[PDB]
C-alpha cells in the first residue's frame, strides 16, 4: 500500500527488535494467520476503552488498607499538599473522599473546574470515582511517612491517544529419512539413533526409536516409525517430538495445525542443540541457524475433528488426592478414580488438575466426554478466584485448548492491579501455549490495550524474550506488533523514544565491557572513554528525555555525565545517572541507572516479582516485611538495565571500610548505621527497619532456596533497609551472620528484644507462606521452567516442597524455622568466609 504503510511497519519493526514480515525460518503461515487473527481483539479493545481513564491511568486498587497502614491514620484525616507554582496549601481530607470531590473541598474552599490532581515529578494521575485511600501512590506515601504532594493541573488530551486506522481410523505413523549435519568430527566417535514421540502436556502417549548407527555428517534410515495410536485419536495440540541419542538435539513439530488440518508432507527441521524439563523444550519454531544446525528429514501422509454417588471410603481417597500438593505423583489408581468419579472431582475446583492430568487425552471418545464435563462448568464459573490455581492449568502439564481456555475465563474477573502483580508469570506461560494465537495472548493484549502501565510492562516484558529467545522470539514478536498497533500515537511515541536511549547505552555499555578486562580495578582511563562516549550521545541523538523502563511514572531528562562512571565489579557495569526532566519535580535528585552486561536479568526479574507476590500475601495478613524489589528489565541477552537504589551500599562494602581490603567484625554493620542516621530516633527507627527487612528476606530467599549468599550480594539503605541482589544464577538456610545479630543486639547465641521480635516476624511470616503453599509451589516451578537451563523435573523443582515444609502441621513448621534460625547462629561467619569457593547439591 501507501509508502506511509511502509513507513510504519519499518517503525513497529525498531521498536519490536524483529521483523514479523520475516518469513526466514517458518514452515507453515501460522505466525501470519495470528497477526491477522489479533487484529479483531485489539480493535474491539481500543473502541471500549474510556479515552479519558485511557490517558490518565489512575492506579487503584479495590483491596482494603492494612491494619499497619490506618496506624498512620488514627484521626480519619489525610494531608495532601496541593501545589500551583510558588503556591502550596495543605488540604485535610477524608480517607473516603473522591479526587474530585476534594478538588471540590478546595476550589471552593479557597476561590475553572477543568483541573485535575497530579503527583509532583511524576506522571501519576488521582483521577476517577475512587476513594482517595484506595490510590496505590497514596498508599506507597502512607506506608512510607512520606507526604502526599501533588499539582493541579490540566488533563491529558486523549486526542494523543489517537490510533492509526488500520487496512481416517488408521495407524499413525512417520517416516525418518535421516539427520544431517555439516561438522562433526568430535573426539571418541559414539553411535546415535532417533527418538519420535508424540506429546500433549508434557506426556508421551506414544515412542518409537530406529536403531543405533554410527554418528557421521549424514545418518541414513529410511524407515518407517508406526505408533499403535489411531490418526483419529491425535488430540488438538499434540507434538511430534523428535530427538537424537548418543540427547544432544530436539525439535518439535505441530502434528495438528492452526486450521484442525493434520500435518502432511515433507519436512526438514533444523534442530536445538542441548547445552552440556525447560520451556525451550517444548517449542515449535525450528532452529534460525539453516548453515551449521543439525536437521532431520521426515515424511508424513496420512482433517480430523470433523446419579452414582461416591462410597465413603472412595470418597476419602478423592479428598486426600485433592488436597496434595500440585507436584505430588499421580499413581493410575488415582487417574482412574478421578476419571471414574468425574463428576464428583468436578465439585472441587482444586481436583481440575489432578483431574484433567487423568484425561486420555491420545483417545477421542475420553476426549469427547471430557468436553461434555466442562459443558456443566457452573461450579467452576462460580468459584472464587484462585490465581495460583489459574496457573496450574496454564503450566506445561496443559496443552488442551479448552482447559486452558477456563483458566483464562477466571483471570478475566482480575483487577488491574492483579494482572500487574502476575504480568510476568502470564507472559511467561505463553510459552506453554501450543498455538501463537491463544486465549492468554489474548488476555494480555487485551489488557495491556486496556490500561498504560499494564501495556508498559507488556511492552518490555515481550521485548526482553524478543531479543534473546531463538526459540518464541516470533510468536512474542506477533503479539507485541498486536499491541503496539493499538496503545495510541502517544504510547507509541514514548515507546520510540525510550527504545532509541537503550539502544544507544547498550552500545556504549558493551563497547566499554571490551575496554575493560575481568580483574577488578577501573582505571580513569576506561571512566575517561566512558565519559567521552556519553558526551556524544548527549548531543543530538539522546532525546530530550523518555520514560524510564521499570518505572513509568518516573520521566529522565538530560545525562549527568560528571556522575556517570563505570562501577568496579567483576561485570563492568555503568552506572548513570539523569536529571527529572519534570520541573514540578519535588526534589533536585537525579534518576540513577546501571547498564549491565554478563548477567541474565531475566532470572532476577523473575526472583523481583515473586518477591512483590510474597509482600502482597503478607499485606492479607497485615505483615509488612519491607522487602524492597527493585526496578530490574532484561532488555538483551545478558543485559539489561537496574534501579539504582539510593543511598545504599554493599554489607561487604561496610566491612571492608572497617577492616582490611578482602578481609569480619560483628560490630560494623551497627557503627555504619548510627554513623549514617541524622538523629537517635532516625537510628531507632533503622534497626526496628532492618529487624522486619531481614526476617522479610531469610524467608523469602529460603523458600526460593537462594538464600546462601556471599556477602557483597546483600544490600542496606542508610535507612535500615537490608535486601538482596544480583539473583543472576558446607552450607547455610539463609544470611543472618554476627553482624547481623549485633544489630538485633545479640551475639553468641543469646536473646534481645529485637531478635526475639526477628524470631516471631519470621514464623508469622513463614507460616503465611505457608497458606499459599500451591501458588508459590507453581510459581517456583514455572520460573525454573522459563528463566533457568536444563532444569531437573524433579529434584530442583521439589525444593519449594520441603522449604514450605509441606504435610506439617503449624506447630512444627514454626519449629522447623526457628531451628534454620540456630544453624545461621552456629556457623557464624564460616559460610561467609567460605564464599570464593561454590555452592551445589
Known amino acids: ?88 496549601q495543605t488540604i485535610k481530607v477524608s480517607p473516603d473522599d473522591t479526587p474530585g470531590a476534594i478538588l471540590q473541598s478546595f476550589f471552593t474552599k479557597m476561590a475553572e473546574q477543568d483541573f485535575v490532581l497530579r503527583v509532583c515529578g511524576r506522571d501519576e ?36 491517544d489517537e490510533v492509526r486506522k488500520e487496512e481416517c481410523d488408521r495407524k499413525f505413523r512417520v517416516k525418518i529419512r535421516g539427520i544431517d549435519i555439516p561438522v562433526l568430527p568430535r573426539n571418541t566417535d559414539l553411535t546415535v539413533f532417533v527418538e519420535a514421540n508424540i506429546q500433549h502436556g508434557q506426556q508421551v502417549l506414544c515412542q518409537r526409536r530406529t536403531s543405533p548407527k554410527p554418528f557421521t555428517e549424514e545418518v541414513l534410515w529410511n524407515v518407517w516409525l508406526e505408533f499403535s495410536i489411531k490418526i483419529k485419536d491425535l488430540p488438538k495440540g499434540a507434538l511430534l517430538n523428535l530427538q537424537i541419542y548418543c540427547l544432544l538435539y530436539y525439535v518439535n513439530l505441530l502434528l495438528i495445525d492452526h486450521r484442525f488440518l493434520l500435518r502432511r508432507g515433507e519436512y526438514v527441521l533444523h534442530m536445538w542443540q542441548i547445552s552440556g524439563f525447560n520451556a525451550d523444550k517444548l517449542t515449535s519454531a525450528t532452529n534460525p541457524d539453516k548453515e551449521n544446525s543439525m536437521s532431520i528429514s521426515i515424511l508424513l501422509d496420512n482433517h480430523p475433528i470433523a446419579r452414582a454417588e461416591m462410597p465413603n471410603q472412595l470418597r476419602k481417597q478423592l479428598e486426600a488426592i485433592i488436597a496434595t500438593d500440585p507436584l505430588n505423583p499421580l499413581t493410575a489408581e488415582d487417574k482412574e478414580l478421578l ?143 498486536a499491541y503496539l498497533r493499538g ?59 523518555f520514560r524510564v523502563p521499570y518505572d513509568p511514572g518516573l520521566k529522565a531528562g538530560a545525562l549527568a555525565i560528571e556522575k556517570c562512571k563505570v562501577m568496579a565489579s567483576k561485570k563492568k557495569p555503568l552506572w548513570l545517572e539523569f536529571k527529572c526532566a519534570d520541573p514540578t519535580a519535588l526534589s533536585n535528585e537525579t534518576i540513577g541507572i546501571i547498564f549491565k552486561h554478563g548477567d541474565d536479568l531475566r532470572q532476577d526479574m523473575l526472583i523481583l516479582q515473586i518477591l512483590r507476590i510474597m509482600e502482597s500475601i503478607w499485606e492479607t495478613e497485615s505483615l509488612d516485611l519491607c522487602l524492597l524489589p527493585y526496578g530490574c528489565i532484561s532488555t538483551g541477552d545478558k543485559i539489561g538495565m537496574i534501579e539504582i537504589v539510593k543511598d545504599a551500599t554493599t ?49 523469602a530467599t529460603f523458600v526460593l532456596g537462594i538464600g546462601d549468599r556471599h556477602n557483597d550480594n546483600i544490600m542496606i539503605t542508610e535507612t535500615g533497609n537490608l535486601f538482596h541482589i544480583d539473583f543472576g544464577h558446607e552450607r547455610v538456610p539463609f544470611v543472618l ?105
Open 737 to 841: 551472620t554476627p553482624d547481623f545479630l549485633f544489630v538485633m543486639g545479640t551475639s553468641g547465641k543469646k536473646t534481645s528484644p529485637h531478635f526475639q521480635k526477628f524470631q516471631d516476624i519470621c514464623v508469622k511470616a513463614y507460616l503465611a507462606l505457608r497458606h499459599h503453599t500451591n501458588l508459590l509451589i507453581i510459581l517456583f516451578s514455572m520460573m525454573l521452567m522459563t528463566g533457568m537451563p536444563q532444569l531437573t523435573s524433579k529434584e530442583d523443582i521439589e525444593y519449594i516442597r520441603d522449604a514450605l515444609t509441606v504435610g506439617k502441621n503449624e506447630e512444627d513448621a514454626k519449629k522447623y524455622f526457628l531451628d534454620q534460625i540456630e544453624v545461621c547462629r552456629d556457623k557464624g561467619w564460616t559460610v561467609q568466609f567460605n564464599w570464593f569457593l561454590h555452592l551445589v547439591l
Open 1 to 88: 500500500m501507501s509508502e506511509e504503510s511502509q513507513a510504519f511497519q519499518r517503525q513497529l519493526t525498531a521498536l519490536i527488535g524483529y521483523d514479523v514480515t520475516d518469513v526466514s525460518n517458518v514452515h507453515d503461515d501460522e505466525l501470519e494467520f495470528t497477526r491477522r487473527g489479533l487484529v479483531t481483539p485489539r480493535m474491539a479493545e481500543v473502541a471500549s476503552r474510556d479515552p479519558k481513564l485511557y490517558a490518565m491511568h489512575p492506579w487503584v486498587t479495590s483491596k482494603p488498607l492494612p491494619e499497619y497502614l490506618w496506624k498512620k491514620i488514627a484521626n480519619n484525616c489525610i494531608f495532601i499538599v496541593i501545589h500551583r507554582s510558588t503556591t502550596s
Open 487 to 545: 496503545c495510541g500515537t502517544a504510547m507509541l511515541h514514548d515507546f520510540t523514544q525510550q527504545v532509541q536511549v537503550i539502544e544507544m547505552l547498550q552500545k556504549v555499555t558493551l563497547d566499554i565491557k571490551s575496554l575493560s578486562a575481568e580483574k577488578y580495578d577501573v582505571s580513569s582511563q576506561v571512566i575517561s572513554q566512558l565519559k567521552q562516549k556519553l558526551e556524544n550521545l548527549q548531543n543530538s541523538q539522546l532525546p530530550e528525555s
Open 651 to 699: 554489607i561487604a562494602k561496610i566491612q571492608q571500610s572497617t577492616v582490611g581490603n578482602t578481609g569480619f567484625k560483628d560490630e560494623v554493620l551497627n557503627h555504619w548505621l548510627k554513623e549514617k542516621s541524622p538523629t537517635e530516633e532516625k537510628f531507632q527507627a533503622a534497626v526496628e527497619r532492618f529487624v522486619y527487612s531481614c526476617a522479610g528476606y531469610c524467608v
Open 339 to 481: 476419571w471414574h468419579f468425574r463428576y464428583e472431582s468436578l465439585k472441587h475446583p482444586k481436583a481440575y488438575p489432578k483431574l484433567f492430568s487423568s484425561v486420555k487425552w491420545g483417545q477421542q471418545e475420553i476426549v469427547a466426554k471430557t468436553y461434555q464435563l466442562l459443558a456443566r462448568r457452573e461450579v467452576w464459573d462460580q468459584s472464587a478466584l484462585d490465581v495460583g490455581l489459574t496457573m496450574q492449568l496454564l503450566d506445561c502439564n496443559f496443552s488442551d485448548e479448552n482447559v486452558r481456555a477456563i483458566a483464562v475465563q477466571k483471570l478475566e474477573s482480575l483487577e488491574d492491579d492483579d494482572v500487574l502483580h502476575y504480568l510476568l508469570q502470564l507472559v511467561q506461560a505463553v510459552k506453554f501455549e501450543p498455538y501463537h494465537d491463544s486465549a492468554l495472548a489474548r488476555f494480555l493484549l487485551k489488557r495491556g490495550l486496556r490500561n498504560k502501565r499494564i501495556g508498559h510492562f507488556l511492552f518490555w516484558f515481550l521485548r526482553s524474550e524478543i531479543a534473546q529467545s531463538r526459540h518464541y522470539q516470533q510468536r512474542f514478536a506477533v503479539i507485541l506488533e
Open 125 to 160: 494521575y488521582l483521577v476517577g470515582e475512587t476513594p482517595i485511600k484506595n490510590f496505590q501512590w497514596v498508599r506507597h506515601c502512607l506506608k512510607n511517612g512520606e507526604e502526599i504532594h501533588v499539582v493541579l493541573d490540566t488533563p491529558p488530551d486523549p486526542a494523543l
